[PDB]
Design a protein around this nucleic acid. Structure first.
Ligand SMILES: Nc1ncnc2c1ncn2[C@@H]1O[C@H](COP(=O)(O)OP(=O)(O)OP(=O)(O)O)[C@@H](O)[C@H]1O
Ligand SMILES: Nc1ncnc2c1ncn2[C@@H]1O[C@H](COP(=O)(O)OP(=O)(O)OP(=O)(O)O)[C@@H](O)[C@H]1O
Ligand SMILES: [Mg+2]
Ligand SMILES: [Mg+2]
Ligand SMILES: [Zn+2]
Lengths: 208, 432, 173, 633, 189
DNA sequence: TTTTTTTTTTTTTTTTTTTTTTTTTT
DNA sequence: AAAAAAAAAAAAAAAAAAAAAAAAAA
């Protein structure tokens, strides 16, 4: 009864999980559910008022204790269920955010240039804050003892020394260690894989 | 028997040694089919021509004789790649890209030859039983015997094997195996009929895994063998032609019963969900309705709404609520009213176009007919029965006779047709 | 005991029959009857996150759990006769989770001997349908995947994805 | 041989493992035995038991699998063992004159779960032949019951001994054997003349029925398919056309299938049949809890209002029509009178009204809630389709009659829609059924009177699109006066525009359209397919529909109230007041209004579960008829 | 790690990595013997690579061999089990014993695919015959795996000689089925 | 006056099945 | 005397659908 609304929220989470599960490429979180969450907040506030009222009505001594225990337990259980639903929804959304934050080579995400995967207004303000400190944590990890290893690098094993690549978007001359790449659009390169991993990750190159 | 063995060997080597790039496609298809209990195999003729032209030439000139040899080659390969045995004889289904022959161009020149043609299904019969393994016993000496039959057109021996009578043998029906047979009726494409001629019809036979695959009104493509059977018409030495189906291609994904299941691979589902997310999908769908008609945006939006349809609800007390949309266009001549009706017929997966002048209540709802042979009464479908789960477009609706028009009242809302004629009292479903 | 599992949260919200063993005022929103207090020996369907606890606290607890409709003798006989053909989705979308829950609350060795056999016999068909990767040059799969529990769909998806990746890597040219 | 004896031993062990079957055998045996000893009699139970497949499944998996998969090699061994056990039980001798010749062997029936063997006449193919199956459907046609010879006994002169010849047929037995020509022997082995002695031979009743698929489950654009079932011995005449049945039996092939001396043809296949073992009707037996609840709910003062309002909770308003339907459900008491007459006990209602006034959604509800109901549409019906049709019996060869809609609904209801759109030639026949309640057939040498006692509820539309209050009532209704006189209650219903009514009814309709069945998610289409799982086991306050069905059944079968004087006093004063008034009623008042008051009073008396007609019944009947005729509400 | 599953199962590319981290034999076409720039590797012993003489047999790690054959400075010798005779012996052993797996190296499929792709010229037998024999072996092994899947329980299983790729493609099904069975058994205690 | 209404008039057989009982024919 | 072949035996008919006339009326 009281928790029947929160179940709906959990159902929404399930749908999001499917979009996370069936994702060939990175996806965007849907709109926040502040209205449903505020409805659970209102009903848990009403439950708190009911618990208070039971407290006074018992402590004036008009009702039997065994009777009051049952509604006390019911209100406590309903509040626990609502907390569980809200926490599960929040943790799923948090996990997806952490995954995206890791899958953009660290960086500040929305403030700096982003891969346009996510719109600003989908996330909540607290989620926007959380993402910022998580990105800072990734950043000061990457400057730790593991400087030589790029903790935000590619996770597919290297098995091809020389690859053919094609430019997707036009750009200017870019210096690389001991040379220069000229990014004329609709041109093909035959070069070592290590040099162009960064440019492939950022969408300026195609193929491998 | 000294040529059949080599033919079977050639077919088995074709199955086991054909490769494109780095995968034995016909070896993998058999194993994948066996797992889901599909005892059949589909072969493309271009691959067979590429592998060896002599094998193709052998099949192209003697189909009824060669095809069973490929049939047994498939099941010999299956028992090798599946078992180190309840595996029946497999089925061969063929695909062709040759030129299509019209129905009226089929004649005595095309007998015993594989042909490719297209038409419209008008009727589907009921399933019948054909024997494959027959257990036989004699009436006097009483010893067991067996017979094996292939459906590519046999009788019990007119003798005795070990006085017994002329042909004494009876069938032990238990321990005998049977398969599924179905008869279908075809018709020409309406635009290919010659001048001043009425459309003609033809008979086809399908077996086993090709039964319950088409529904009346469907446009299909058929690959099969043109053959004749002596039967029965005062002509001397005349025979009746028919077609034994080997391969069917159908535009509508729906099977005979329309399983209401997805027949879409993920490659098409991804395309559909990508389409659904377009912010301006409504405008795109509206602009696609009759692009050769100027203006009339609201009518096109209404047509889109009719095509998609609403939701249907069932209530605890047994109430049923309609979930379909009906549209009326009452207007002035020359305003493209009749050029939208024929477009809706084309776009809709299931749709019928009729005229109100040439119509009747029996033709629209259902009719009752008498079988010449059985001499009983049976029900036959009509315009609203064929167009179930689809759309019916009634033109010249104002010219309908007042008796015929009133027969649609129950079908429009209650979506049922009640027949109480000639000892038959039933209610048929009609959601159109 | 997964706090953040979505499917456990959903399956834990199902309704089970139960009977009140006491007479208490103040309730009634359980019956959707606000002012009316609940009487003794009243049979209502309560959610599992409530009925599980109300049957422990009292001695005799406040509420008694009644035998469920999904664990009747008919369902057991249907499971025993033909495991593969049975439509578990129609019975309940969360059959297995509730099955282990019911075994945990009430120690029932008979149910543990039937559910295990059902799962073992359905796993073979699941593997057969998951291993059938189509080759470009059936009704069975579509029919079978509409009879799958919520838990079995996850296993089907995992097995199918693993098989497709293996086949893709084997035949990459 | 050896396998036969081994299977007989297995079934014999199964029989003494579970003692229930042995007790049922003894109960039947003692009943039949002590029935024949009652010379001053006040009838005979057949030799057939029903065993559960489930118990056999735990006992022996191999035997259960054999019965389900290969019935023709496991049922005959079981029947012999059952006969042996039954013979062992019967200790008392029976030196009957002729029962020695005919043993009447014991047979078997099955129940439980069939797994994948529960099908319909459409999903039955060549893969299920020689298997035990169960099919669900509707009976359409039945054949006449004929006797069939199974054994013949002949007497030989000059020697004084008897000789018997046995006969078998394809439909008689589960195993194929050498056929018999069914010709009585005339010469002895030594040439002595043989005389046939009827009264010592054996004959068995034979019938053939046709079972069709339920039309609601058919695929889109397809017509329902049917199958043939053969019934024998004690299974004869347990079904009638229109019934919903579930038949368990063996799916069998028969004939030669065109693989014989006849010419080779692609159009010739084998013939398929079912040898039914059991038939189950898909009468709700009431326990003491249900009867006690009914008697407790009877004593409530406002029971009529609750019962009437429980009908069709998805319709807003129409309270008086819903009361009239309830009074129809509990019909009046029929009086048989001299000169071969009967006063009808049925209540007939007509509804005339404006378009979209929920007239057709009440007929559909009556179709579902009532025990027996037949649906009819005006334009899609004929006179020969309502009364009877002359047909032929293929199996035996005679000419017979086939029932129509009216006669199939004996002691039931007929719901006719678009009643005014029916042709005149069609409308005369219904007149006779409404008047005499009998059909007269005098065609093709078949002279017969058929019983049709049905209640009629009908819906129609006025001559114009909508009812006109500025014109006389007879101008609005196109029906003739003779037909219109045969309806007890005529309800003229009109849709009037009013803002409060619109606000309430729109709210109700919008609330109804937002209902989600349990177990379905939002946006999930309803899967009204059942996934071929036909069955799992093969055999202010409102009230639930099954409880209402039990209440109606109990009232119809247990109470027969009689009229009283003090109710007659109210009825006569109401009739006299109504007759002599200048109010313009929508229908004329005549001497048949008194009979309507009597019938409505009797029905209301039945509703109260009482054996007498009280004053309150007369008051309720008077109020209902005043609302119907006047609208004074 | 986290994205694209990868939580508890290896991808085929990682299996290929592990396979290429294994030694192989070669015939150098160059002589880098020290005279009478050097390799100085950190994860593999470089003694053989530093001391190389033409037309002599040495062994190095697989990926270096592929990198060398990308140029014209190497020729990899296929293992002795990649022969028609040795494959037909294993096919017969596979046929005769229907309840045990034949003894093939734990990288036979991956090594066969890699060698067919890269070093096509080095094989002595025709390559189509070997490619057919590999499929013939794989089908029978699949039949045996399908039969063995019926004996699943809660205690333990033994798969003595199953290959790496075969184990990888079957791990998620097997582990989860036995885990669910174990929970069902544990609940009833 | 041009609309609706109304009677009414052929429409039917071309097919079936395995015994059972007859004539020819080695 | 014993085989193979060849006919008799049908019967039946109401119930419904479509089309063209020869009498009725807003
Ligand atoms: N808006 C339009 N755009 C294009 N073609 C049009 C349009 N309106 C009419 N036409 C053309 O006019 C011709 C006749 O139109 P159509 O046959 O649809 O008429 P209609 O509305 O059915 O008339 P009627 O009322 O006389 O039956 C067609 O060639 C059609 O293409
Ligand atoms: N009082 C009502 N309550 C609920 N639904 C109603 C009511 N009146 C009409 N409807 C709705 O109107 C629709 C049509 O009703 P229905 O088919 O019963 O009308 P009808 O009287 O038979 O009409 P017709 O004169 O056109 O044959 C249905 O969807 C029905 O639910
Ligand atoms: Mg037009
Ligand atoms: Mg209606
Ligand atoms: Zn013989």
């Amino acid at each position: 009864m009281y928790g029947d609304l929160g179940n709906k929220l959990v159902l929404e989470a399930k749908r999001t999980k499917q979009l996370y599960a069936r994702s060939n490429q990175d996806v965007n979180l849907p709109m926040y559910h502040e209205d449903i969450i505020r409805n659970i907040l209102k009903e848990v506030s009403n439950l708190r008022k009911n618990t208070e009222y039971l407290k006074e009505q018992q402590q004036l001594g008009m009702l039997d204790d065994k009777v009051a225990k049952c509604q006390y337990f019911v209100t406590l259980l309903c509040m626990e269920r609502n907390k569980r639903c809200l926490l599960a929804y929040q943790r799923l959304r948090t996990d997806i955010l952490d995954s995206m934050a890791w899958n953009n080579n660290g960086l500040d995400l929305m403030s700096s240039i982003t891969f346009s995967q996510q719109d600003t207004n989908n996330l909540s303000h607290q989620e926007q804050e959380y993402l910022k400190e998580y990105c800072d944590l990734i950043t000061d990890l990457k400057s730790g003892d593991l400087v030589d290893i790029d903790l935000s690098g590619s996770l597919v094993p290297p098995s091809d020394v020389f690859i053919d690549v094609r430019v997707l978007k036009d750009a200017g001359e870019i210096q690389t260690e001991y040379g220069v790449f000229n990014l004329i659009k609709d041109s093909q390169f035959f070069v070592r894989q290590s040099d162009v991993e960064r440019l492939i990750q950022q969408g300026y190159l195609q193929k491998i | 028997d000294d040529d059949n063995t080599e033919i079977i060997k050639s077919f088995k080597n074709f199955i086991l040694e054909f490769r494109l790039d780095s995968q034995f496609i016909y070896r993998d298809q058999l194993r994948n089919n066996i797992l889901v209990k599909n005892y059949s195999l589909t072969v493309n003729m271009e691959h067979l021509i590429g592998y060896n032209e002599d094998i193709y030439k052998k099949l192209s000139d003697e189909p009824s004789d060669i095809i069973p040899l490929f049939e047994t080659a498939i099941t010999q390969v299956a028992k090798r790649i599946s078992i180190l045995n309840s595996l029946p004889t497999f089925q061969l289904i063929l695909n062709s890209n040759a030129n299509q022959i019209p129905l009226r161009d089929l004649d005595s020149e095309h007998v015993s030859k594989i042909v490719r043609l297209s038409g419209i299904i008008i009727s589907t019969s009921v399933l019948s039983s054909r024997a494959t393994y027959l257990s036989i016993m004699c009436r006097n000496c009483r010893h067991t015997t067996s017979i094996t039959i292939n459906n590519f057109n046999v009788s019990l021996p007119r003798s005795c094997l070990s006085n017994c009578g002329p042909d004494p043998y009876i069938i032990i029906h238990e321990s005998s195996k049977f398969i599924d047979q179905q008869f279908l009726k075809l018709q020409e494409i309406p635009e290919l009929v010659p001048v001043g001629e009425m459309p003609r019809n033809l008979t086809m036979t399908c077996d086993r895994y090709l039964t319950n695959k088409v529904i009346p009104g469907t446009r299909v493509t058929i690959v099969g063998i043109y053959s004749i059977y002596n039967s029965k018409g005062s002509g001397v030495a005349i025979r009746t032609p028919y077609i034994k189906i080997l391969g069917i291609q159908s535009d509508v994904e729906t099977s005979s019963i329309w399983n209401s299941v997805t027949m879409f691979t993920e490659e098409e589902e991804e395309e559909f969900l990508q389409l659904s997310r377009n912010p301006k999908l409504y405008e795109i769908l509206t602009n696609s309705i009759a692009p050769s008609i100027f203006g009339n945006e609201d009518i096109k939006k209404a047509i889109v709404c009719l095509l998609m349809g609403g939701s249907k609800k069932i209530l605890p007390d047994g109430m049923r609520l309609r979930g379909d949309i009906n549209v009326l266009l009452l207007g002035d001549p020359g305003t493209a009213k009749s050029q939208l009706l024929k477009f809706v017929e084309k776009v809709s997966p299931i749709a019928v176009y009729t005229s109100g002048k040439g119509s009747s209540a029996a033709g629209l709802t259902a009719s009752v007919q008498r079988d010449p042979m059985t001499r009983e009464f049976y029900l036959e479908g009509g315009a609203m029965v064929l167009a179930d789960g689809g759309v019916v477009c009634i033109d010249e609706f104002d010219k309908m006779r007042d008796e015929d028009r009133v027969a649609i009242h129950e079908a429009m809302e209650q979506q049922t047709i009640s027949i109480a004629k000639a000892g038959i009292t039933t209610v048929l479903n009609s959601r159109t | 005991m997964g706090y953040y599992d979505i499917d456990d949260v959903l399956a834990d919200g199902t309704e089970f029959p139960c009977k009140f063993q006491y007479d208490i005022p103040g309730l009634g929103y359980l019956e959707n009857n606000p002012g009316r207090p609940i009487t003794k020996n009243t049979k209502l369907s309560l959610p599992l996150w409530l009925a599980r606890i109300l049957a422990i606290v009292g001695p005799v607890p406040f509420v008694e759990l009644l035998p469920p409709d999904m664990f009747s003798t008919k369902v057991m006989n249907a499971i025993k006769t033909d495991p593969v053909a049975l439509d578990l989705h129609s019975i309940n979308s969360h059959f297995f989770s509730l099955a282990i829950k019911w075994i945990m609350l009430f120690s029932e060795k008979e149910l543990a001997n039937v559910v295990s056999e059902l799962l073992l016999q359905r796993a073979q068909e699941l593997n057969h349908h998951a291993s059938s990767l189509s080759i470009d040059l059936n009704i069975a799969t579509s029919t079978f995947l509409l009879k799958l529990e919520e838990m079995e769909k996850e296993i089907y998806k995992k097995s199918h994805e693993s098989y497709k990746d293996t086949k893709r890597w084997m035949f990459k040219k | 041989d050896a396998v036969f004896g081994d299977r007989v031993r297995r079934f014999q062990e199964f029989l003494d493992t579970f003692t229930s079957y042995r007790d049922s055998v003894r109960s039947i045996q003692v009943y039949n035995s002590n029935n024949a000893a009652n010379y001053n009699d006040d009838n005979i139970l057949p030799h057939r038991i029903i065993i559960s497949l489930d118990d056999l499944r735990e006992f022996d998996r191999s035997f259960w699998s054999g019965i389900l998969v290969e019935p023709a090699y496991f049922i005959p061994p079981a029947e012999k063992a059952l006969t042996d056990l039954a013979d062992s039980m019967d200790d008392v001798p029976h030196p009957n004159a002729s029962a020695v010749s005919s043993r009447h062997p014991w047979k078997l029936s099955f129940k439980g779960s069939f797994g994948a063997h529960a099908l319909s006449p459409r999903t039955l193919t060549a893969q299920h032949l020689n298997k035990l199956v169960s099919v669900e459907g509707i009976v359409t046609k039945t054949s006449l019951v004929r006797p069939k010879l199974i054994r013949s006994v002949h007497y030989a002169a000059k020697t004084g001994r008897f000789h018997y010849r046995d006969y078998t047929d394809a439909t008689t037995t589960l195993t194929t054997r050498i056929p018999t020509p069914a010709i009585y022997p005339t010469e002895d082995t030594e040439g002595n003349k043989l005389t046939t002695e009827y009264g010592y031979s054996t004959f068995i009743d034979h019938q053939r029925i046709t079972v069709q698929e339920m039309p609601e489950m058919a695929p889109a654009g397809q017509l329902p398919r049917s199958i043939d079932v053969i019934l024998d011995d004690d299974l004869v005449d347990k079904t009638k056309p229109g019934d919903r049945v579930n038949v368990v039996g063996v799916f069998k092939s028969l004939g030669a299938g065109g693989m014989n001396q006849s010419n080779s043809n692609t159009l010739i296949g084998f013939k398929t049949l079912i040898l039914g073992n059991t038939v189950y009707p898909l009468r709700q037996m009431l326990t003491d809890f249900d009867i006690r609840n009914i008697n407790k709910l009877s004593k409530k003062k406002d029971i009529f209002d609750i019962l009437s309002q429980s009908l069709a909770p998805s319709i807003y308003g129409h309270d008086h029509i819903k009361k009239a339907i309830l009074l129809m459900l509990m019909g009046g008491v029929e009086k048989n009178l001299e000169n071969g007459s009967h006063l009808r006990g049925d209540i007939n209602i007509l509804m005339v009204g404006d378009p979209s006034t929920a007239k057709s959604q009440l007929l559909r509800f009556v179709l579902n809630t009532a025990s027996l109901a037949i649906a009819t549409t005006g334009r899609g019906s004929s006179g020969v389709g309502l009364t009877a049709a002359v047909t032929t019996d293929r199996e035996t060869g005679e000419r017979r009659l086939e029932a129509g809609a009216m006669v199939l609904a004996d002691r039931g209801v007929v719901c006719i829609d678009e009643f005014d759109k029916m042709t005149d030639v069609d409308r005369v026949a219904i007149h006779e059924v409404m008047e005499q309640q009998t059909v007269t057939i005098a065609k093709a040498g078949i002279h017969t009177t058929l019983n049709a006692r049905c209640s009629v509820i009908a819906a129609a539309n006025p001559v114009f699109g909508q009812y006109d209050v500025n014109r006389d009532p007879h101008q609005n209704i196109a029906l003739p006066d003779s037909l219109l006189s045969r309806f007890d209650l005529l309800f003229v219903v009109t849709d009037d525009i009013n803002e409060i009514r619109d606000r309430s009814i729109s709210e109700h309709v919008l609330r109804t359209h937002r209902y989600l069945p349990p177990g379905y998610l939002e946006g999930e289409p309803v899967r009204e397919r059942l996934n071929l799982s036909l069955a799992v086991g093969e055999d202010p306050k409102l009230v639930t529909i099954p409880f209402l069905r039990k209440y109606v059944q109990y009232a119809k079968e247990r109470v027969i109230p009689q009229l009283t004087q003090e109710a007659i006093n109210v009825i006569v004063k109401n009739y006299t007041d109504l007759r002599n008034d200048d109010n313009t009623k929508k229908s004329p008042i005549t001497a048949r209004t008194l009979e309507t008051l009597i019938r409505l009073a009797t029905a209301h008396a039945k509703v109260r579960l009482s054996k007498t007609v009280n004053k309150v019944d007369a008051k309720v009947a008077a109020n209902l008829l005043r609302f119907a005729l006047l609208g004074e509400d | 790690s986290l994205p694209a599953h990868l939580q508890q199962t290896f991808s085929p590319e990682e299996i290929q990595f592990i396979v290429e981290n294994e030694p192989i034999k070669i015939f150098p076409r160059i002589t880098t013997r020290q005279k009478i720039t050097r390799w100085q590797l950190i994860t593999t012993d470089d003694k053989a690579l530093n001391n190389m003489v033409a037309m002599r047999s040495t062994e190095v790690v697989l990926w270096i061999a592929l990198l060398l054959k990308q140029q014209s400075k190497c020729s990899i010798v296929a293992p002795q089990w990649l022969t028609t005779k040795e494959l037909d012996r294993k096919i017969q052993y596979e046929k005769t014993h229907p309840d045990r797996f034949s003894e093939l190296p734990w990288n036979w499929l991956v090594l066969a695919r890699i060698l067919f792709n890269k070093a096509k010229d080095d094989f002595h037998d025709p390559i189509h015959e070997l490619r057919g024999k590999i499929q013939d072996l794989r089908e029978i092994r699949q039949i045996k795996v399908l039969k063995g899947l019926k004996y699943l329980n809660e205690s333990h299983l033994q798969l003595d000689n199953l290959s790496l790729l075969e184990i990888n493609e079957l791990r998620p099904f097997i582990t989860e089925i036995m885990d669910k069975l174990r929970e069902i058994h544990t609940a009833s205690l």
